[PDB]
Design a protein around this nucleic acid. Sequence first.
DNA 1: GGATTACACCCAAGACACCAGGCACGAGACAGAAA
RNA 2: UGCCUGGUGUCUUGGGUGU
DNA 3: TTTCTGTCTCGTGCCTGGTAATCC
Lengths: 49, 98
Amino acid sequence: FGEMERDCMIAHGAAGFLKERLMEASDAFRVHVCGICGLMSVIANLKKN
Amino acid sequence: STTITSGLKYSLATGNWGEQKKAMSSRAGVSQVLNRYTYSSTLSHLRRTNTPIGRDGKLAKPRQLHNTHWGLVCPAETPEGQACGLVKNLSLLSGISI
DNA sequence: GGATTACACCCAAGACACCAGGCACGAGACAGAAA
RNA sequence: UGCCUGGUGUCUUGGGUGU
DNA sequence: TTTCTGTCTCGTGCCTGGTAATCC
Ligand SMILES: [Zn+2]
């Protein structure tokens, strides 16, 4: 889904379809960020909460 | 005896015309896999010539069909896209001096 | 001097740390030697 | 009672296909 | 020659480092 297709989707005005194509139908990921430093250095352990 | 043997075999196998450790800056594509889809394709492949001007710094003049090409290369047969005009096929009565 | 020169798709083919040389463990054979 | 499997290199290069 | 054996070579093993345009 190259850049020209992205431009066509922008021209159509469909932001939801573009977001879904580039996230859900592709590499979606979840990260944790510190609310102070703003870096992705949070050592998150989901099972221990 | 391994030096010459490996050098020749590598250059013929990969098409890079040079030493193995100098693969960069060597003329690539000299040796190609023979096209055996049909008899005419094999015959055409065995009589093909290449102009190593590349893609960088391209110009229309090398790709054109010149007046002096008459009788020595085919006016009709040339690839499409990047290599158009740069790849030529010998005419059906042409030869190369020895 | 630096930076950049259309988009997408298919297939095939050849290369990818090798090595050599110095250090250790175990073994065994053919020759020593008493009888 | 003898009991069922999803896991697929990379980098180059070449030749092609549709505009 | 019979028998216990030595001890130094040697097979198997391994560590680890050398070695082309144009344009601003
Ligand atoms: Zn923080």
